[PDB]
């Protein structure tokens, strides 16, 4: 299998592949999150360069991970689907074994853990 | 089955019957149980026909590949390859094989390989279901350094009795002579050997 170390340290102690991934996020459409006293609101930008779009069927920016947790993102759209899918699977797995839906902190810790794993695994960016 | 191999002054002679049975039905009355794994290294087969054929085919392949790299193999080497197959696959095999060959340095040699996969170098060897009936005869009549004619008579008489008493043995008596002169095939029909 392809084992090549793509994410590696540089002389100044930086992992450029991780830093260049942040530049992809900088390119992505804006997303905002604000929490009130008894609610949270997720705002998302849709770039109007794309008209003649079918807004019924086009992938929405905010995705339900479970009935009580949502996930929005900025960056590569194709990459986000992989994280969302993994998160949705883990949410159902948690309910199955712990008999309780995930905490927002736990689901975050899982998604973050997946992202970290892809920064020191061979053959992946 | 009645098979035997006998060393003598000029080399070694292999002998066998020609009967293959499925219960009491003789599936083949003209079988050739003397098979060639190398120019002057042959074997006698007893037990399962499928197993002994598969083994002999593999051994012939190993010795052909040995010869291509290291030159003519010894009879001892051929016996070792048979052994390695019979020993390591003893749970799944039913094969009783006698290996016989002629070198110029070692002359005639005989190795018997029974069910377990053990090897036994001997002056002569007998095997197969019909061998049981001639242990007494063969022990009393065998001599070392016999002539070719004497050894043919010894095998012919021995297998004649084995055939006479064993139902799994019969047909013609095939023999293969291995000397410096070359390889001679012999055959003896019922009308000849039954009257002995």
């Amino acid at each position: 299998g392809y084992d090549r170390a793509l994410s590696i340290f540089s002389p100044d102690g930086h992992i450029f592949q991780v830093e260049y991934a942040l530049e992809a996020v900088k390119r992505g459409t804006c997303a905002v999150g604000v929490k009130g006293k008894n609610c949270v609101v997720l705002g998302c930008e849709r770039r109007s360069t794309l008209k003649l779009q079918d807004t019924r069927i086009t992938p929405s920016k905010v995705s339900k991970i479970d009935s009580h947790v949502v996930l929005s993102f900025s960056g590569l759209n194709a990459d986000s689907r992989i994280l969302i899918e993994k998160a949705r699977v883990e949410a159902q797995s948690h309910r199955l074994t712990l008999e309780d839906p995930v905490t927002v902190e736990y689901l975050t810790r899982y998604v973050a853990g997946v992202q970290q794993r892809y920064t020191q695994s061979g053959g992946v960016r | 089955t009645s098979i035997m191999a006998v060393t003598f002054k000029d080399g070694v002679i292999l002998g066998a019957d020609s009967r293959t049975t499925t219960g009491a039905y003789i599936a083949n009355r003209v079988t050739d149980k003397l098979t060639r794994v190398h120019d002057k290294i042959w074997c006698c087969r007893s037990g399962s026909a499928a197993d002994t054929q598969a083994i002999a085919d593999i051994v012939q392949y190993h010795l052909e590949l040995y010869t291509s790299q290291y030159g003519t193999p010894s009879t001892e080497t051929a016996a070792s390859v048979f052994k390695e197959l019979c020993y390591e696959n003893k749970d799944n095999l039913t094969a009783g094989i006698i290996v016989a060959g002629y070198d110029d340095k070692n002359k005639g040699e005989v190795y018997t390989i029974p069910l377990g996969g053990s090897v036994h170098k001997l002056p002569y060897a007998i095997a197969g279901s019909g061998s049981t009936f001639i242990y007494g005869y063969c022990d009393k009549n065998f001599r070392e350094n016999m002539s070719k004619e004497e050894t043919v008579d010894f095998i012919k008489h021995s297998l004649s009795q084995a055939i006479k008493w064993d139902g799994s043995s019969g047909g013609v008596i095939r023999m293969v002579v291995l000397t410096a002169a070359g390889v001679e095939r012999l055959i003896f029909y019922p009308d000849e050997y039954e009257q002995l």
Partner: protein
Amino acid sequence: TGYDLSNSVFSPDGRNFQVEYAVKAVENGTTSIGIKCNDGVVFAVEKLITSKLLVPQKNVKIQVVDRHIGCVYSGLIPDGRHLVNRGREEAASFKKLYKTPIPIPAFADRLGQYVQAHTLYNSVRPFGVSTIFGGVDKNGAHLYMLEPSGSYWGYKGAATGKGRQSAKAELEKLVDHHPEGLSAREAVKQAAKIIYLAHEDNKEKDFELEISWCSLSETNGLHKFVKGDLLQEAIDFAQKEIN
């Protein structure tokens, strides 16, 4: 250019430069020789005494394979050990399947193919040793020498290391002056002399002589080290010839 940065790459000549660089490591090593005699073979090697703190007769270089084959080498010592370990596996599996101990020509190709395989890929480095080896089998005595490329031939006499040219010249004299042949005991004496003569190329540090032999008459076709009185006798003969 760049053809010499990676193993298994043909240069525009049709050469494998990495293998040619391995030969340089061999040429840097101590001198080792092999002499084919009437009914066997003799191996000898130069051991440089780097310090007084080295325990005499303890750091043994010549290695036995099976019980009838001797192996000595010049260059990277660990690479030679790795090759002998493989040789011991090859010899074991041969004897396991075919019963007889591995013939010397058969054993030579086993090492040859293995060394040659280390010139086929860039993921491996070639061997940094030339190995002189041989012994007694059913067909008599055999001496071989194997290079980093996997190339090997049979030899009447063989030499490698830093003092190979001096040694080769001495071996050529023995071939000419003894067409009928050389005895095993003579070959031990001559081997000692040749190492002492070849030591002029490594004359800064003093050295320790190490000899071994396989002979049909003298050792029953088994590999043995030359020790005690027979070693001292060969040292005395060698010391007498240089003076």
